Design a protein around this nucleic acid. Structure first.
Ligand SMILES: [Mg+2]
Ligand SMILES: [Mg+2]
Ligand SMILES: [Mg+2]
Ligand SMILES: [Mg+2]
Ligand SMILES: [Mg+2]
Ligand SMILES: [Mg+2]
Ligand SMILES: [Mg+2]
Ligand SMILES: [Mg+2]
Ligand SMILES: [Mg+2]
Ligand SMILES: [Mg+2]
Ligand SMILES: [Mg+2]
Ligand SMILES: [Mg+2]
Ligand SMILES: [Mg+2]
Ligand SMILES: [Mg+2]
Ligand SMILES: [Mg+2]
Ligand SMILES: [Mg+2]
Ligand SMILES: [Mg+2]
Ligand SMILES: [Mg+2]
Ligand SMILES: [Mg+2]
Ligand SMILES: [Mg+2]
Ligand SMILES: [Mg+2]
Ligand SMILES: [Mg+2]
Ligand SMILES: [Mg+2]
Ligand SMILES: [Mg+2]
Ligand SMILES: [Mg+2]
Ligand SMILES: [Mg+2]
Ligand SMILES: [Mg+2]
Ligand SMILES: [Mg+2]
Lengths: 83, 138, 99, 124, 104, 208
RNA sequence: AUGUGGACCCGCCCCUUGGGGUGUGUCCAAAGGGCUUUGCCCGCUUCCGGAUGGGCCCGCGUCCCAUCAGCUAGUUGGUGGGGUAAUGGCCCACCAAGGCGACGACGGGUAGCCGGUCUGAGAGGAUGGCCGGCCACAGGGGCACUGAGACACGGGCCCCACUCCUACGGGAGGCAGCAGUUAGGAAUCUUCCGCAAUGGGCGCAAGCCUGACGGAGCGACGCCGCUUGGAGGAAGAAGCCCUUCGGGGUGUAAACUCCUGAACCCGGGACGAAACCCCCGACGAGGGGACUGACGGUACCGGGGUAAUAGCGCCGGCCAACUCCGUGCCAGCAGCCGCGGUAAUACGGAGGGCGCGAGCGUUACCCGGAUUCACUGGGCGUAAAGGGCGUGUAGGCGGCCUGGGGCGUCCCAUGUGAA
């Protein structure tokens, strides 16, 4: 199906992910559908998580499924405003 | 036949100036006329006029030259150092306004024909059109 | 050796045999209807075509035909059947046909 | 040519003709040394030049120059070939790598030592 | 937008099909001279209605046979065998060009 | 690399007085002082009119050997000031003078650029409180260049920063002799430098 | 059986290629499991819609040879049928006699294409290796099965070649998956660690699988950063330089003038990891310490502390850098011009010098310079180059004036030009 995961784009020992809409069958680092955020897991930058929250709602509305870790960051930006 | 009227005129001029003639006759065309309008207004000749030669229409073209210089070879400096037909039959040349050449860093002109009419480059860059590049005349 | 997913091959056979019968049923039932229609036996001929359209859709319930592979086989069938009954026939039972 | 002619025919480009058929265009070829002859140079020079017919693993049969002083190149010694026309011998367009396999490198040189493949003098 | 082309019927010897000669002028990449060029299309004529000679519009269609993916849209101007002739003559010069002579 | 050999033999080859011995090329013995002919068993014979190449060359080894930099770093620098906006000539010198090994020499912490290099390499110098041990680190404007808390009491610093009392620094540095912390105010301009070097050649040399 | 609905044949209307509505007739549905058990969870059937992925069709672009000029029989079209998810000569019977080609068909040679890469002032030239996209293959040839999807690399059948087992009848195989061996070759790595991170399959979940992956290993192969810090004389058992066993330079350059402190030693020691899950709220509530680190005790931080690797090419001109000796068209150098024949800055050593420096040189190949295939940008009286001359086909090119169209040309807006 279509998913929302992380595609690793850093350097050796330097990870930087790209929250991405993509067909699961596709390579991890190959041609995705749309970028909807980035994640720096080491918080070396004061802005280490961005999310186009408007857009996430669009892909979650046509049935994108996130991974456990992608779901984390979506909640942190408050994609699903559980309130 | 004649295969190129504009080139022909541009040459007749170039030839006649090298021998410092007064005027020079070129057979008449609404198009050629529209070009000499530019050559006058940009200051390369004194002007043209529709004289009729053997009951057939021509265009006397009165040429300008610099002042009588000194030393050996007193002949004056040309006002027209250079004049060259660019788009020719079987080799049509078109520029969009982004691609119009600045001739000689602007010390000379490039006549070109557009859907707005026959203009210089500075003129056609003003109105934002391009077209058939007709010649340089620095 | 012996990847235990040659069990997949054991099943392909079991399936292949299941499909292959349903096809032959449709095939020898569809000829029977055409051949009953090329004789004016209109009552018997629709009694059998009606049965054949049924096995057609049934066989399209599982993976054997699915899709418009079935639709097509029904289109080709009722079209052939009606024409032949139109060489002098009058659809008596007129089961699966609408006129 | 007219413009219509450039359109019809056109320009034609230039082929590289390699002055070294070290077959696969490799940078070196191994070869088994056959004749270890001696050739007299041409036009304006005189000497006894040391050449070697070499049987290539590329199936080739080419002659190559033995640079340096003396060699040790027997009827069946094995050797490595590189590029290098020798202006003075015609037909000779390769060199031998002194210091590899049977072609022991020149001895006692103190200057251009990475050519001629002489190790560091133990002068330390 | 299904591509649409304008061209000349040059063949009617087929059943329900016409050959159309679509010309296309365009400037040359390196030398910039404007060059004519042409290509033939087999086009669907459902009623053997378009006769040899006229100019038609060709429209991109669902495939109909091998090498035949256009139907004839509408006639533009009727007969003009000057173009067929130009084409018929071009074809006949091949009569030479071989191992001997031919018709010039 | 870094060259690192006999220096006051280059004072002589370029023929222009050079300060590689930092303290010593001032007193009457930079070797230049009363021996200005080039080295070798040939430094006294007469020089033939050099080819335009040699001129361009010598003008480049001059500039490079002033800053004690490997040709690898140098060309990589010039090619950056070529790509950079503005006059390709002077931008170069501003980059060379933005090198932290040089800034530490310009701020009078060591006497030569050489000794200055070794003070960076040994982490005696801080930029903006943090230690830095890279002679090629590029100081930016607004970067205060201090001296290591550990090394404040060290012999060579006490001596070398003392003689800085009274002296003036460039109109693009601002040192404070008290806390031993200068600051990089501004990228130096061509007239700010007294380099006996014609960069116009150095440019031309690489345009070959 | 049930008919929410959908499929088929005739129709009816809208639409216009097989799009949507509609009537008669016919035909078609289903699966159970778990429970903190009668209501929750994960499933199941038919239909519409979305999203993702893909099939097919068309315009245009896409190397060399004309010492390959004619090519074509399912070949081109038609009706009808077969096949398919679907168009189609994809396939089949019957009919017509067509189709393609100098704007290069047919043939041969070569080659995965591209985003890009290298070069060039640019136009252009060269290329397609890592990374990303598409295609094709999985010892060679062919074929179908299963299925949403395959003509299926670690699935099936047959034939061919190779290897292995063989009781001689018959059987087993397929690293162009990670590693590794072997052969060939100028030349190309560890049978390593790990499921911690990201991603995939399955599972309600706990989890399981994952040589995808994240890491470490080897190799100056590449790029980048960095160290070797520097103040002093000169007796040849065959081995310290420069006018004959003779005239200065090396050279501020040292085996030791102080300073700092690579290696090394001692102690602290990480980011990468918060989710899945448990717990309150409704089985996603700002509580989970529930737990998780291969790299690795490494990066990094603090203390102790030693003066501590330099090599390679070149020095006739192009081309930065010169002298002494040996050698005498010999030994040899050489990219091109060239040097060696007794006085050699060219060979071989030496001293000195120039260039670069953990690298420096050689060879190979590409672009450059080369305006030397010239569009930008070349030529043809004698330097290479006007056809022996004509006639004329196709093609290219086309005097003055007016009017219509807007194909070329120009302008604005817009979609696309992924990473
Ligand atoms: Mg199973
Ligand atoms: Mg039923
Ligand atoms: Mg190939
Ligand atoms: Mg194999
Ligand atoms: Mg399935
Ligand atoms: Mg199937
Ligand atoms: Mg498989
Ligand atoms: Mg395998
Ligand atoms: Mg071998
Ligand atoms: Mg996982
Ligand atoms: Mg790996
Ligand atoms: Mg944490
Ligand atoms: Mg939480
Ligand atoms: Mg010189
Ligand atoms: Mg030499
Ligand atoms: Mg001599
Ligand atoms: Mg010499
Ligand atoms: Mg380095
Ligand atoms: Mg060129
Ligand atoms: Mg060029
Ligand atoms: Mg030209
Ligand atoms: Mg020429
Ligand atoms: Mg001649
Ligand atoms: Mg003649
Ligand atoms: Mg005209
Ligand atoms: Mg238009
Ligand atoms: Mg746009
Ligand atoms: Mg892009």
């Amino acid at each position: 199906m279509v998913k929302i995961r992380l595609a690793r784009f850093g350097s050796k020992h330097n990870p930087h992910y790209r929250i991405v809409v993509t067909d699961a069958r596709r390579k991890r680092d190959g041609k995705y559908i749309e970028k909807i955020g980035y994640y720096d897991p080491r918080k070396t930058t004061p802005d280490w998580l961005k999310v186009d929250v408007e857009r996430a709602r669009y892909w979650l509305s046509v049935g994108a499924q996130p991974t456990d870790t992608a779901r984390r960051l979506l909640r942190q930006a408050g994609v699903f405003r559980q309130e | 036949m004649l295969t190129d009227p504009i080139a022909d005129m541009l040459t007749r001029i170039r030839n006649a100036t090298r021998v410092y003639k007064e005027s020079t006759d070129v057979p008449a065309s609404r198009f050629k006329e529209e070009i000499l309008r530019i050559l006058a207004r940009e200051g390369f000749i004194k002007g043209y006029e529709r004289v009729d030669v053997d009951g057939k229409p021509y265009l006397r073209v009165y040429l300008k030259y610099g002042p009588r210089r000194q030393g050996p070879d007193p002949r004056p400096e040309q006002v027209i150092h250079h004049i060259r037909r660019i788009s020719k039959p079987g080799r049509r040349v078109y520029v969009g306004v982004k691609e119009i050449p600045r001739v000689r860093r602007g010390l000379g002109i490039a006549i070109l024909s557009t859907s707005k009419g026959v203009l210089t480059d500075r003129e056609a860059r003003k109105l934002g059109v391009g077209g058939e590049l007709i010649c340089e005349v620095w | 050796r012996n990847l235990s997913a040659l069990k997949r091959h054991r099943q392909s056979l079991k399936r292949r045999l299941r499909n292959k019968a349903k096809k032959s049923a449709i095939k020898t039932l569809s000829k029977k209807a055409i051949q009953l229609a090329q004789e004016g036996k209109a009552e018997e001929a629709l009694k059998i075509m009606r049965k054949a359209e049924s096995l057609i859709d049934k066989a399209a319930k599982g993976s054997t035909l699915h899709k418009n592979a079935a639709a097509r086989r029904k289109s080709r069938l009722m079209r052939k059947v009606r024409q032949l009954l139109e060489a002098a026939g009058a659809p008596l039972i007129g089961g699966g046909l609408s006129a | 040519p007219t413009i219509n002619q450039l359109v019809r025919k056109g320009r034609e480009k230039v082929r590289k003709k390699s002055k070294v058929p070290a077959l696969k265009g490799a940078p070196f070829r191994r070869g088994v040394c056959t004749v270890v002859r001696t050739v007299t140079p041409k036009k304006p020079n005189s000497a006894l030049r040391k050449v070697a017919k070499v049987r290539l693993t590329s199936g080739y049969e080419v002659t190559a120059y033995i640079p340096g002083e003396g060699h040790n190149l027997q009827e069946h010694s094995v050797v490595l070939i590189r590029g290098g026309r020798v202006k003075d011998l015609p037909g000779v367009r390769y060199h031998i790598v002194r210091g590899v396999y049977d072609a022991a490198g020149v001895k006692d040189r103190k200057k251009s030592r990475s050519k001629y493949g002489t190790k560091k003098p133990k002068e330390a | 937008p299904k591509k649409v082309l304008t061209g000349v019927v040059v063949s009617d010897k087929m059943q329900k099909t016409v050959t159309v000669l679509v010309e296309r002028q365009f400037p040359h990449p390196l030398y910039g001279k404007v060059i004519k060029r042409s290509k033939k299309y087999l086009a669907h004529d459902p009623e053997e209605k378009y006769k040899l000679g006229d100019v038609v519009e060709i429209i991109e269609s669902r495939p109909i046979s091998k090498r035949k993916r256009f139907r004839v849209l509408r006639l533009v101007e009727s007969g003009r065998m000057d173009l067929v002739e130009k084409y018929l003559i071009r074809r006949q010069n091949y009569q030479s060009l071989s191992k001997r002579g031919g018709k010039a | 690399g870094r060259y690192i050999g006999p220096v006051c033999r280059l004072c002589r080859r370029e023929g222009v007085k050079l300060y590689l011995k930092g303290e010593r090329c001032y007193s009457p013995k930079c070797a230049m002082e009363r021996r200005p002919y080039p080295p070798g068993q040939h430094g006294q014979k007469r020089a033939r009119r050099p080819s335009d190449y040699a001129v361009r060359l010598r003008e480049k080894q001059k500039l490079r050997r002033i800053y004690g930099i490997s040709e690898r770093q140098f060309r990589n620098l010039f090619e950056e000031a070529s790509k950079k906006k503005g006059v390709t000539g002077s931008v170069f010198l501003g980059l060379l003078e933005s090198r932290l090994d040089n800034v530490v020499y310009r701020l009078g912490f060591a006497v030569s650029r050489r000794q200055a290099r070794q003070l960076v390499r040994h982490g005696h110098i801080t930029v903006n409180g943090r230690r830095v041990d890279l002679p090629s680190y590029r100081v930016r404007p607004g970067d205060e260049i201090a001296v290591a808390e550990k090394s404040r009491n060290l012999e060579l610093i006490r001596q070398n920063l003392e003689a800085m009392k009274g002296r003036k620094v460039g109109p693009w540095l601002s040192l404070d002799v008290e806390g031993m912390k200068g600051k990089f105010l501004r990228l130096p301009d061509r007239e700010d430098l007294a380099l006996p070097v014609n960069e116009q050649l150095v440019i031309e040399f690489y345009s070959r």
